[model samples]
Target: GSSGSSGEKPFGCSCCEKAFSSKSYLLVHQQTHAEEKPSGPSSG
Candidate 1:
């Protein structure tokens, strides 16, 4: 369902503001957004 359009975003994520064309394809990615990563790793 790719029309190759400029603004044809079917689904936008709440965490990343990214778009996804497919429903099933979109569902999997939403989790990563919710699980935000911490900043700056510690060094020895």
Candidate 2:
């Protein structure tokens, strides 16, 4: 039985648009963004 609305993190990194298998991993990957601080749409 399932409660529905069930899904795994598939760990998606909002920082770089990458997906992992664990949440912790995704967060860890975010660190990379800290240094790069992606820029493109924020400025106009």
Candidate 3:
């Protein structure tokens, strides 16, 4: 289920135009973009 805060979309993504409420969530999500082109897999 989506959190009420998640749906709030307070933070906006500059890369792909996404949105998130919390900085932690945004930070975690940024890893996905950062790791997508990596030579090796990365995990949080």
Best by TM-score: 3
Clashes of 2: 0
Q: Estimate TM-scores for all models.
A: 0.49, 0.50, 0.56
Per-model root-mean-square deviation over C-alphas: 5.8, 6.5, 6.9
What's model 3's TM-score?
0.56
- Pairs that clash in candidate 2: none
Clashes in predicted model 3 = 0
Lowest-lDDT window of 10 residues in candidate 2? 2-11
Off by over 4 Å in 3: 1-6, 38-44
lDDT of 3 at 40: 64
**Candidate 1: TM-score?**
0.49
- For model 2, residues 1-44, the per-residue Cα lDDT tens digits are 86533356556766455677777877778888777465756775
Query: Roughly what TM-score does model 2 have, to 2 decimal places?
Result: 0.50
Off by over 4 Å in 2: 1-9, 38-44
Which number leads on lDDT?
3
